[PDB]
Amino acid sequence: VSLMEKLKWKIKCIENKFLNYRLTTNETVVAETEYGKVKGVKRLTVYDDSYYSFEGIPYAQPPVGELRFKAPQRPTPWAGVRDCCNHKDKSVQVDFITGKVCGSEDCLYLSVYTNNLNPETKRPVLVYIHGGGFIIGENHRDMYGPDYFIKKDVVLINIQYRLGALGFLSLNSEDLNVPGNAGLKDQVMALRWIKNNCANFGGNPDNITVFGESAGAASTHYMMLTEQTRGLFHRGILMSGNAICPWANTQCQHRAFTLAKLAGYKGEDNDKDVLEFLMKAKPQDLIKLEEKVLTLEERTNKVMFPFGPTVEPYQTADCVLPKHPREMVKTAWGNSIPTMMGNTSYEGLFFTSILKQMPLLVKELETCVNFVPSELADAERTAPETLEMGAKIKKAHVTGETPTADNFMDLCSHFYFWFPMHRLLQLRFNHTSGTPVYLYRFDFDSEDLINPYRIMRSGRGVKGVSHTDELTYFFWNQLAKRMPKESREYKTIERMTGIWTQFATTGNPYSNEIEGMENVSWDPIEKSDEVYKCLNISDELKMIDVPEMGKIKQWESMFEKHRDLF
């Protein structure tokens, strides 16, 4: 458990060291950027492809010292040619295997990849925003390698942004000018850099697609909601997440004091003095104590992370979320670009690790009161309003006589992913105008090719298609290897990067380019279909009604006399 793969991870980080060097070439090139010239280097893949790599391009000022917790400031445009032949490090975070803190505050970088720099005509630009709960993640190629996408004629850009309290501290007093959402404002400025720089790498600035998985999906949705990013891109793909997910959003303004207190602060709960302490502390001490900010009860109520995107307590210079997610769906420019959304066929299997420890988690399901949406439920969660709402949940997911893991994990698929998706689509349908949304369901199961997230649900061996299982067919990671191109895994890489690039190009995810799509006719959802159609992606590709629709609809029935709140 962990120490097992702790040494594994160690003896697979040193691979990535011996393979990264080996796959480096001598072919350097220089591209224009608005801040000055940048030097990249051609790299190779295990499939005998190659691509140009520019890593460590700053899109903002290093947010250190006085810039800590504040909105990003654009960088200093440099003389000469800046080295981008190496990664820069990841935002400060608790690494999943080591367990202790890694990364740096100097993390506001993006990386640009493409198989050809002078291309004949201009390529679609895909911008990937990583997930990780807004508390972990990176654009390092041990985790998100572009090796599969650069088989296609696209420009791929992978961004970083501030995580944890360093990204998402929020304070009421306008005075202190720490409204929240620093990490989302980082994303905004990365997208602004992309808009005005992608042409320098062969990109088409009229054909940008933003996509992300989990917190990166919530992020992509936030970038579709704010008027700050209006017009800055043209398609969005939400993979296992949106901004009205219960975990995508927390009111955290009174949690800074608690963080300060855990770290040694002596003084009041006044924000000015709380800030003066948190500005002086070592970044790693804060990040390691993040752990403990949420209260014992906040956890019962399913608040997942102490700091994250929030409704800002006032709107200044660079605001992005002046209002709650459901309300921004109203005039949001992004409802009017082509969109694809989807989930895996067993998201909640991504709770085995948690559940393993104190299986008491399961008895929750005896009334399911804790999974009632927080906005409908009472603080104690025993108002007859709440016990009866929970009975509705409880019936949709408890299958027989007594609750288990599968019911709990199945319940989690809906609480954290499918139900919010449903709520978003229906809100979207009436804050709208003609704009296709397409649904997929990722249902391809394999153990011969994996990604690191599998050992951070330290599961190994276990079937079903968990949250994050799809990333393996989009991105290279240091646990990957060269599969034979007959294999079901290689074919799935082909299909997934093919569909995503097809969507990025025309706003329509279908083509006869895709072996296996030959019998797929895949149309969007509209305001009126009673039941959602989706492309189910397995060893075969098949259009089907979402199997989850029945459980979704009963979740909707908790709102039968609170319809305004649905």
Coordinates of C-alpha atoms in Angstrom, one line a residue:
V1 CA 0.0 0.0 0.0
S2 CA 1.6 3.3 -1.3
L3 CA 5.1 2.2 -0.1
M4 CA 4.8 -0.6 -2.6
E5 CA 4.4 1.9 -5.4
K6 CA 6.3 4.7 -3.6
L7 CA 9.5 2.7 -4.7
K8 CA 7.7 1.9 -8.0
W9 CA 6.9 5.5 -8.6
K10 CA 10.5 6.3 -7.7
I11 CA 11.7 3.6 -10.2
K12 CA 9.3 5.0 -12.8
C13 CA 10.2 8.7 -12.3
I14 CA 13.8 7.7 -13.1
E15 CA 12.6 6.0 -16.2
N16 CA 10.9 9.1 -17.4
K17 CA 14.2 10.7 -16.7
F18 CA 16.1 8.2 -18.8
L19 CA 13.4 8.2 -21.6
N20 CA 12.9 12.0 -21.6
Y21 CA 16.6 12.6 -22.3
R22 CA 16.7 9.8 -24.8
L23 CA 13.6 11.2 -26.7
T24 CA 15.2 14.6 -26.8
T25 CA 16.6 15.8 -30.2
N26 CA 19.1 18.5 -31.1
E27 CA 16.5 20.3 -33.3
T28 CA 15.8 23.6 -31.6
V29 CA 13.7 26.3 -33.1
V30 CA 12.6 29.8 -32.1
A31 CA 9.1 31.2 -32.3
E32 CA 7.8 34.8 -31.9
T33 CA 5.8 35.5 -28.7
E34 CA 4.4 38.9 -27.7
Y35 CA 6.8 38.9 -24.7
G36 CA 9.8 37.9 -26.8
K37 CA 11.3 34.9 -28.7
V38 CA 11.1 31.4 -27.2
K39 CA 13.3 28.4 -27.8
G40 CA 11.8 24.9 -28.1
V41 CA 13.1 21.5 -29.0
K42 CA 11.8 18.6 -31.1
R43 CA 11.1 15.5 -29.1
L44 CA 10.2 11.9 -30.0
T45 CA 7.5 9.4 -29.0
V46 CA 7.5 5.7 -28.3
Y47 CA 5.4 5.4 -31.4
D48 CA 8.2 6.9 -33.6
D49 CA 6.4 10.2 -34.1
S50 CA 7.9 13.5 -33.2
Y51 CA 6.8 17.0 -32.2
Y52 CA 8.1 20.5 -31.3
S53 CA 7.9 21.2 -27.6
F54 CA 7.9 24.6 -25.9
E55 CA 7.6 24.2 -22.1
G56 CA 7.8 26.9 -19.4
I57 CA 6.3 29.7 -21.3
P58 CA 5.2 32.3 -18.6
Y59 CA 1.8 33.8 -19.2
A60 CA 1.8 35.7 -15.9
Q61 CA 4.1 37.2 -13.4
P62 CA 5.4 34.8 -10.8
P63 CA 2.8 35.2 -8.0
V64 CA 5.2 35.3 -5.2
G65 CA 5.7 37.7 -2.3
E66 CA 3.2 40.5 -2.5
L67 CA 1.4 38.7 -5.4
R68 CA 0.5 35.7 -3.3
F69 CA -3.2 35.2 -3.2
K70 CA -3.7 38.0 -5.7
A71 CA -5.0 38.2 -9.3
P72 CA -2.3 37.4 -11.9
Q73 CA -0.2 40.1 -13.5
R74 CA 1.1 39.6 -17.1
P75 CA 4.9 39.1 -17.4
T76 CA 8.0 41.1 -18.4
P77 CA 8.7 40.9 -22.1
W78 CA 12.2 39.7 -22.5
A79 CA 15.3 40.5 -24.5
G80 CA 16.8 37.8 -26.6
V81 CA 15.5 34.2 -26.7
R82 CA 14.1 32.5 -23.6
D83 CA 14.8 28.8 -23.0
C84 CA 11.7 26.6 -23.2
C85 CA 13.5 23.3 -23.7
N86 CA 12.6 22.2 -20.1
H87 CA 9.5 22.0 -17.9
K88 CA 9.1 24.4 -15.0
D89 CA 7.7 22.9 -11.8
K90 CA 4.1 22.3 -10.7
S91 CA 2.1 24.5 -8.3
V92 CA 2.7 23.8 -4.7
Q93 CA 0.7 20.7 -3.7
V94 CA 0.7 17.5 -1.7
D95 CA 2.0 14.8 -4.0
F96 CA -0.1 11.7 -4.1
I97 CA 2.6 9.1 -3.8
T98 CA 5.4 10.8 -1.8
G99 CA 2.6 12.2 0.4
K100 CA 4.7 15.3 1.3
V101 CA 4.7 18.6 -0.4
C102 CA 6.3 19.3 -3.8
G103 CA 6.1 22.1 -6.3
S104 CA 6.8 25.9 -6.2
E105 CA 4.8 29.1 -6.1
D106 CA 6.6 30.0 -9.4
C107 CA 4.2 27.9 -11.5
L108 CA 2.3 30.2 -14.0
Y109 CA 3.4 28.5 -17.2
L110 CA 2.0 26.8 -20.2
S111 CA 3.5 24.3 -22.8
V112 CA 2.9 24.3 -26.5
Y113 CA 3.2 21.2 -28.8
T114 CA 2.8 20.6 -32.5
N115 CA 4.1 18.1 -35.1
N116 CA 5.0 20.9 -37.6
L117 CA 5.8 24.6 -37.1
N118 CA 5.5 26.0 -40.7
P119 CA 2.3 24.1 -41.5
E120 CA 0.7 24.6 -44.9
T121 CA -2.7 25.9 -43.5
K122 CA -3.6 26.9 -39.9
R123 CA -4.3 24.2 -37.4
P124 CA -7.0 23.9 -34.7
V125 CA -5.8 24.7 -31.2
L126 CA -6.7 22.4 -28.3
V127 CA -6.1 23.8 -24.8
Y128 CA -6.1 21.3 -21.9
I129 CA -6.9 22.2 -18.3
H130 CA -5.9 19.5 -15.9
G131 CA -8.0 18.3 -13.0
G132 CA -7.1 17.3 -9.5
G133 CA -9.7 18.9 -7.3
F134 CA -8.1 22.4 -7.7
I135 CA -5.5 21.1 -5.2
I136 CA -3.1 18.8 -7.4
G137 CA -2.0 18.6 -10.9
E138 CA 0.6 19.8 -13.5
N139 CA 1.4 20.1 -17.2
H140 CA 4.5 17.9 -16.9
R141 CA 4.7 15.2 -19.5
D142 CA 5.2 12.4 -17.0
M143 CA 1.5 13.0 -16.5
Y144 CA 0.1 14.7 -19.6
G145 CA 2.3 13.9 -22.5
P146 CA 1.1 15.1 -25.9
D147 CA 2.5 12.0 -27.7
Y148 CA -0.9 10.8 -28.9
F149 CA -2.5 14.1 -29.9
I150 CA 0.5 15.1 -32.0
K151 CA -0.3 12.2 -34.4
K152 CA -3.0 14.6 -35.4
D153 CA -2.5 17.9 -37.2
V154 CA -3.4 20.1 -34.2
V155 CA -1.6 22.5 -31.8
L156 CA -2.0 21.2 -28.2
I157 CA -1.4 23.5 -25.2
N158 CA -1.3 22.4 -21.6
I159 CA -1.7 25.0 -18.9
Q160 CA -0.9 25.3 -15.2
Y161 CA -2.7 27.4 -12.6
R162 CA -2.4 28.0 -8.9
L163 CA -3.9 25.3 -6.7
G164 CA -5.1 25.0 -3.1
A165 CA -5.3 28.0 -0.8
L166 CA -2.6 29.7 -2.9
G167 CA -5.1 29.6 -5.7
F168 CA -8.4 30.0 -3.9
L169 CA -8.0 32.0 -0.7
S170 CA -10.9 34.4 -0.4
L171 CA -11.5 37.4 2.0
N172 CA -14.5 39.6 2.5
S173 CA -12.8 42.9 3.2
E174 CA -12.6 44.7 -0.1
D175 CA -9.6 46.6 1.4
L176 CA -7.4 43.5 1.1
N177 CA -8.1 42.9 -2.6
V178 CA -8.1 39.1 -2.3
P179 CA -11.6 38.4 -3.6
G180 CA -10.9 34.7 -4.4
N181 CA -10.5 32.6 -7.6
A182 CA -6.9 33.5 -8.2
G183 CA -6.4 30.1 -9.9
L184 CA -9.3 30.7 -12.3
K185 CA -7.9 34.2 -13.2
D186 CA -4.7 32.4 -14.0
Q187 CA -6.6 30.3 -16.5
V188 CA -8.2 33.4 -17.9
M189 CA -4.8 35.0 -18.6
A190 CA -3.4 31.7 -20.0
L191 CA -6.3 31.8 -22.5
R192 CA -5.6 35.4 -23.3
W193 CA -2.0 34.4 -24.1
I194 CA -3.2 31.6 -26.3
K195 CA -5.6 33.8 -28.2
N196 CA -2.8 36.2 -29.2
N197 CA 0.1 33.7 -29.4
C198 CA -1.1 30.5 -31.0
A199 CA -0.7 31.9 -34.5
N200 CA 3.1 31.9 -33.8
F201 CA 3.0 28.1 -33.5
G202 CA 0.8 27.3 -36.6
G203 CA -2.5 27.8 -34.7
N204 CA -5.7 29.2 -36.0
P205 CA -6.8 31.8 -33.4
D206 CA -10.4 31.5 -34.8
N207 CA -10.6 27.8 -33.9
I208 CA -9.6 27.2 -30.2
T209 CA -11.1 24.4 -28.2
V210 CA -10.8 24.3 -24.4
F211 CA -11.1 20.9 -22.7
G212 CA -10.5 19.4 -19.3
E213 CA -11.3 16.5 -17.0
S214 CA -12.9 16.8 -13.5
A215 CA -11.7 20.1 -11.9
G216 CA -10.4 20.8 -15.4
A217 CA -13.9 20.3 -16.7
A218 CA -15.3 22.6 -14.0
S219 CA -12.6 25.0 -15.0
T220 CA -13.4 24.8 -18.8
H221 CA -17.1 25.4 -17.8
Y222 CA -16.1 28.5 -15.7
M223 CA -14.1 29.8 -18.7
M224 CA -17.4 29.4 -20.7
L225 CA -19.3 31.4 -18.1
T226 CA -17.4 34.6 -17.5
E227 CA -17.7 37.6 -19.7
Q228 CA -14.0 38.1 -19.2
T229 CA -13.2 35.3 -21.6
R230 CA -16.0 36.2 -24.1
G231 CA -15.1 35.2 -27.7
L232 CA -11.7 33.8 -26.7
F233 CA -12.5 30.3 -27.9
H234 CA -14.9 28.4 -30.0
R235 CA -15.6 25.0 -28.6
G236 CA -15.7 23.4 -25.2
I237 CA -15.4 19.8 -24.0
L238 CA -16.4 19.0 -20.4
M239 CA -15.0 15.6 -19.3
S240 CA -16.5 14.3 -16.0
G241 CA -17.3 17.8 -14.6
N242 CA -19.0 21.1 -14.7
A243 CA -19.2 24.2 -12.5
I244 CA -22.4 23.3 -10.7
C245 CA -21.0 20.0 -9.5
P246 CA -21.2 20.2 -5.6
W247 CA -17.4 19.9 -5.4
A248 CA -16.7 22.7 -7.9
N249 CA -17.8 25.4 -5.6
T250 CA -17.5 26.3 -1.9
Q251 CA -18.0 29.5 0.2
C252 CA -14.6 29.5 1.9
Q253 CA -14.3 33.1 3.3
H254 CA -14.2 32.0 7.0
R255 CA -11.7 29.2 6.3
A256 CA -8.6 31.4 5.9
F257 CA -8.7 32.1 9.7
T258 CA -8.8 28.4 10.3
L259 CA -5.8 27.8 8.0
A260 CA -3.8 30.5 9.7
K261 CA -4.7 29.0 13.1
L262 CA -3.5 25.6 12.0
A263 CA -0.2 27.1 10.9
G264 CA 0.6 29.0 14.1
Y265 CA -1.3 32.3 13.8
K266 CA -1.8 34.2 17.1
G267 CA -4.4 37.0 16.8
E268 CA -8.0 37.7 16.0
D269 CA -10.4 36.5 13.2
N270 CA -10.0 39.7 11.3
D271 CA -9.1 39.4 7.7
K272 CA -6.4 42.1 7.5
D273 CA -4.4 40.4 10.3
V274 CA -5.2 36.9 9.0
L275 CA -3.7 37.9 5.6
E276 CA -0.6 39.4 7.1
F277 CA 0.2 36.0 8.6
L278 CA -0.7 33.9 5.6
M279 CA 1.5 36.2 3.4
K280 CA 4.5 35.5 5.7
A281 CA 4.2 31.8 6.0
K282 CA 6.2 29.2 4.0
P283 CA 4.0 28.0 1.1
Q284 CA 4.5 24.3 1.9
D285 CA 3.3 24.6 5.6
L286 CA 0.0 26.0 4.4
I287 CA -0.4 23.4 1.7
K288 CA 0.3 20.4 4.0
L289 CA -2.2 21.7 6.6
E290 CA -4.9 22.3 3.9
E291 CA -5.7 18.7 4.9
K292 CA -7.4 20.0 8.1
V293 CA -9.2 23.2 7.3
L294 CA -12.7 21.7 6.7
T295 CA -14.7 21.0 9.9
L296 CA -15.8 17.5 11.1
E297 CA -19.4 18.5 10.1
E298 CA -18.4 20.2 6.8
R299 CA -17.2 16.7 5.8
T300 CA -20.6 15.1 6.7
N301 CA -22.2 17.7 4.4
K302 CA -19.9 16.5 1.6
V303 CA -17.8 19.7 1.2
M304 CA -14.9 18.2 -0.6
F305 CA -12.1 20.8 -0.5
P306 CA -11.6 23.7 1.9
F307 CA -10.5 26.1 -0.8
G308 CA -11.8 26.2 -4.4
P309 CA -13.8 28.4 -6.7
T310 CA -16.1 30.7 -4.8
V311 CA -18.6 33.5 -5.2
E312 CA -16.5 36.5 -4.8
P313 CA -17.6 38.9 -1.9
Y314 CA -17.2 42.0 -4.2
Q315 CA -16.3 42.5 -7.8
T316 CA -13.1 44.5 -8.7
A317 CA -10.6 44.8 -11.6
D318 CA -10.5 41.3 -12.9
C319 CA -13.6 39.4 -11.5
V320 CA -14.7 36.1 -13.0
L321 CA -17.5 34.7 -10.6
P322 CA -19.5 37.6 -9.3
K323 CA -22.4 35.2 -8.8
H324 CA -23.2 31.6 -8.1
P325 CA -22.7 29.0 -10.9
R326 CA -26.5 28.4 -11.7
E327 CA -27.0 32.2 -12.1
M328 CA -24.1 32.7 -14.5
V329 CA -25.6 30.1 -16.9
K330 CA -28.1 32.9 -17.7
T331 CA -26.4 35.2 -20.2
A332 CA -23.1 33.3 -20.3
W333 CA -21.4 33.7 -23.7
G334 CA -20.3 30.0 -23.6
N335 CA -23.8 28.6 -23.8
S336 CA -23.6 29.7 -27.5
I337 CA -20.5 27.7 -28.6
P338 CA -20.5 24.0 -29.6
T339 CA -20.0 21.8 -26.6
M340 CA -19.4 18.2 -25.8
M341 CA -19.9 16.7 -22.3
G342 CA -19.5 13.2 -20.9
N343 CA -18.7 10.8 -18.0
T344 CA -17.3 7.3 -17.6
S345 CA -19.6 4.4 -17.1
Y346 CA -18.7 3.9 -13.4
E347 CA -17.4 7.2 -12.1
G348 CA -17.9 6.4 -8.4
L349 CA -15.6 3.5 -8.5
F350 CA -13.3 6.4 -7.9
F351 CA -14.2 6.2 -4.2
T352 CA -12.7 2.7 -3.4
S353 CA -9.7 4.2 -1.6
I354 CA -11.7 6.5 0.6
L355 CA -14.2 3.8 1.2
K356 CA -11.6 1.2 2.2
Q357 CA -10.8 3.3 5.2
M358 CA -13.6 3.2 7.9
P359 CA -16.3 1.4 5.7
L360 CA -18.7 3.2 8.1
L361 CA -19.0 5.5 5.1
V362 CA -21.5 2.9 3.7
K363 CA -24.1 3.2 6.5
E364 CA -24.8 6.8 5.4
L365 CA -26.9 5.0 2.7
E366 CA -29.3 3.7 5.4
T367 CA -31.1 7.0 5.0
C368 CA -28.8 8.8 2.5
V369 CA -29.5 12.1 4.2
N370 CA -25.9 13.2 3.7
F371 CA -26.2 13.1 -0.1
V372 CA -29.3 15.3 -0.3
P373 CA -28.2 18.4 -2.2
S374 CA -26.9 20.8 0.5
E375 CA -29.1 23.7 -0.7
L376 CA -32.3 21.6 -0.2
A377 CA -31.2 20.0 3.1
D378 CA -31.3 21.3 6.6
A379 CA -28.1 21.8 8.7
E380 CA -28.7 18.7 10.9
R381 CA -30.3 16.8 8.0
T382 CA -33.3 15.4 10.0
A383 CA -36.1 17.8 9.0
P384 CA -38.8 15.4 7.6
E385 CA -38.1 17.4 4.4
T386 CA -34.6 15.9 4.3
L387 CA -35.3 12.3 5.4
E388 CA -37.9 12.0 2.7
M389 CA -35.7 13.6 0.0
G390 CA -33.0 11.1 1.1
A391 CA -35.4 8.2 0.7
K392 CA -35.7 9.2 -3.0
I393 CA -32.0 9.1 -3.5
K394 CA -31.8 5.9 -1.4
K395 CA -34.3 4.1 -3.6
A396 CA -32.5 5.1 -6.9
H397 CA -29.3 3.4 -5.7
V398 CA -30.0 0.8 -3.0
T399 CA -30.9 -2.2 -5.1
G400 CA -32.0 -4.8 -2.6
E401 CA -32.2 -5.2 1.2
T402 CA -29.1 -3.5 2.6
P403 CA -26.5 -1.0 1.3
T404 CA -23.1 -2.0 -0.1
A405 CA -20.1 -0.5 -1.9
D406 CA -21.5 -0.7 -5.4
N407 CA -24.6 1.2 -4.3
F408 CA -22.4 3.7 -2.5
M409 CA -20.1 4.0 -5.5
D410 CA -23.0 4.1 -7.9
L411 CA -24.6 6.8 -5.7
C412 CA -21.4 8.8 -5.9
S413 CA -21.4 8.6 -9.7
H414 CA -24.7 10.6 -9.6
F415 CA -24.0 13.0 -6.7
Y416 CA -20.7 14.2 -8.1
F417 CA -21.2 13.8 -11.9
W418 CA -24.4 12.8 -13.6
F419 CA -27.0 14.8 -11.6
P420 CA -25.0 18.1 -12.0
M421 CA -24.7 17.4 -15.7
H422 CA -28.5 17.0 -16.0
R423 CA -29.0 20.2 -14.0
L424 CA -26.6 22.1 -16.2
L425 CA -28.1 20.9 -19.5
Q426 CA -31.6 21.9 -18.4
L427 CA -30.5 25.3 -17.2
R428 CA -28.6 25.7 -20.4
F429 CA -31.6 24.9 -22.5
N430 CA -33.3 28.0 -21.3
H431 CA -30.4 30.4 -21.3
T432 CA -29.6 29.7 -24.8
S433 CA -30.2 30.0 -28.6
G434 CA -29.2 27.5 -31.2
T435 CA -26.1 25.7 -30.0
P436 CA -25.4 21.9 -30.2
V437 CA -24.4 19.9 -27.1
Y438 CA -23.2 16.3 -27.7
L439 CA -23.0 13.6 -25.1
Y440 CA -20.5 10.8 -24.8
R441 CA -20.2 7.9 -22.2
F442 CA -16.7 6.5 -21.8
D443 CA -17.1 2.8 -21.3
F444 CA -13.8 1.2 -22.4
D445 CA -12.2 -1.0 -19.7
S446 CA -8.5 -2.1 -19.7
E447 CA -5.7 -2.9 -17.3
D448 CA -2.9 -3.3 -19.8
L449 CA -2.5 0.5 -20.1
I450 CA -3.1 2.8 -17.1
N451 CA -2.4 6.2 -15.6
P452 CA -1.1 7.4 -12.2
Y453 CA -4.6 8.3 -10.9
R454 CA -5.3 4.5 -10.7
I455 CA -2.8 4.1 -7.9
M456 CA -4.2 7.2 -6.1
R457 CA -7.3 5.2 -6.0
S458 CA -4.8 2.6 -5.1
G459 CA -7.0 0.0 -6.7
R460 CA -5.0 -2.1 -9.2
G461 CA -6.8 -5.1 -10.7
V462 CA -10.3 -3.8 -10.4
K463 CA -12.8 -3.7 -13.3
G464 CA -15.2 -1.0 -14.3
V465 CA -14.4 2.4 -15.8
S466 CA -13.6 4.8 -13.0
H467 CA -13.4 8.6 -13.0
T468 CA -10.1 9.5 -14.7
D469 CA -9.8 6.1 -16.6
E470 CA -10.2 7.9 -20.0
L471 CA -7.1 10.1 -19.6
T472 CA -5.0 7.0 -20.5
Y473 CA -6.2 7.2 -24.1
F474 CA -5.6 10.9 -24.5
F475 CA -2.2 11.5 -22.9
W476 CA 1.1 9.8 -22.4
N477 CA 2.2 9.2 -18.9
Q478 CA 5.3 7.7 -17.4
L479 CA 3.4 4.5 -16.6
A480 CA 2.5 4.0 -20.2
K481 CA 4.2 2.0 -23.0
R482 CA 4.0 1.3 -26.7
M483 CA 1.0 -0.8 -27.5
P484 CA 0.6 -2.7 -30.8
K485 CA -1.7 -0.9 -33.1
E486 CA -4.0 -3.8 -33.5
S487 CA -4.7 -3.7 -29.8
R488 CA -8.0 -2.6 -28.3
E489 CA -6.1 0.1 -26.4
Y490 CA -4.3 1.6 -29.4
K491 CA -7.6 1.6 -31.3
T492 CA -9.2 3.5 -28.4
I493 CA -6.3 6.1 -28.4
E494 CA -7.1 6.5 -32.0
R495 CA -10.8 7.0 -31.5
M496 CA -10.5 9.3 -28.6
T497 CA -7.9 11.7 -30.1
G498 CA -9.8 11.4 -33.4
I499 CA -13.2 12.4 -32.0
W500 CA -11.7 15.2 -29.9
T501 CA -9.8 16.6 -32.9
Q502 CA -12.8 16.2 -35.1
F503 CA -14.9 18.2 -32.6
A504 CA -12.2 20.8 -32.1
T505 CA -12.2 21.3 -35.9
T506 CA -15.8 21.5 -37.0
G507 CA -17.8 21.5 -33.8
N508 CA -19.3 18.1 -34.7
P509 CA -17.7 15.0 -33.2
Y510 CA -18.6 12.6 -36.0
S511 CA -16.5 11.3 -38.9
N512 CA -16.0 8.2 -41.2
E513 CA -12.2 8.8 -40.4
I514 CA -12.8 6.9 -37.2
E515 CA -12.6 3.1 -37.6
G516 CA -15.6 2.0 -35.7
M517 CA -17.8 5.1 -36.2
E518 CA -19.1 3.7 -39.5
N519 CA -22.6 3.1 -38.1
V520 CA -22.7 6.0 -35.7
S521 CA -25.2 8.8 -36.4
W522 CA -24.6 11.1 -33.4
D523 CA -26.9 14.2 -33.0
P524 CA -26.9 16.6 -30.0
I525 CA -29.4 16.8 -27.2
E526 CA -32.2 19.5 -27.4
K527 CA -34.5 21.2 -25.0
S528 CA -37.3 18.7 -25.3
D529 CA -35.7 15.2 -25.6
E530 CA -37.1 13.5 -22.5
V531 CA -34.2 11.0 -22.5
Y532 CA -30.6 11.9 -23.4
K533 CA -28.8 10.1 -26.3
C534 CA -25.0 9.5 -26.0
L535 CA -22.2 7.9 -27.9
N536 CA -21.2 4.9 -25.7
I537 CA -17.5 4.4 -26.2
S538 CA -16.4 0.8 -25.6
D539 CA -14.7 -1.9 -27.8
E540 CA -17.5 -0.8 -30.1
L541 CA -19.0 2.7 -30.6
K542 CA -22.8 2.7 -30.2
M543 CA -25.5 5.4 -29.8
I544 CA -27.7 4.6 -26.8
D545 CA -29.9 6.2 -24.3
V546 CA -27.9 7.2 -21.2
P547 CA -28.3 4.2 -18.8
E548 CA -28.2 6.6 -16.0
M549 CA -31.3 8.6 -17.0
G550 CA -33.6 6.7 -14.7
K551 CA -31.6 7.5 -11.6
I552 CA -31.0 11.1 -12.8
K553 CA -34.8 11.7 -13.0
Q554 CA -35.5 10.6 -9.5
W555 CA -32.7 12.9 -8.3
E556 CA -34.6 15.6 -10.1
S557 CA -37.7 14.6 -8.0
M558 CA -36.2 15.8 -4.8
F559 CA -37.0 19.3 -6.3
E560 CA -40.7 18.6 -6.9
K561 CA -41.8 21.5 -4.6
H562 CA -38.5 23.4 -4.9
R563 CA -38.5 23.7 -8.6
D564 CA -36.9 27.2 -8.5
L565 CA -33.9 25.5 -7.0
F566 CA -33.4 22.7 -9.6

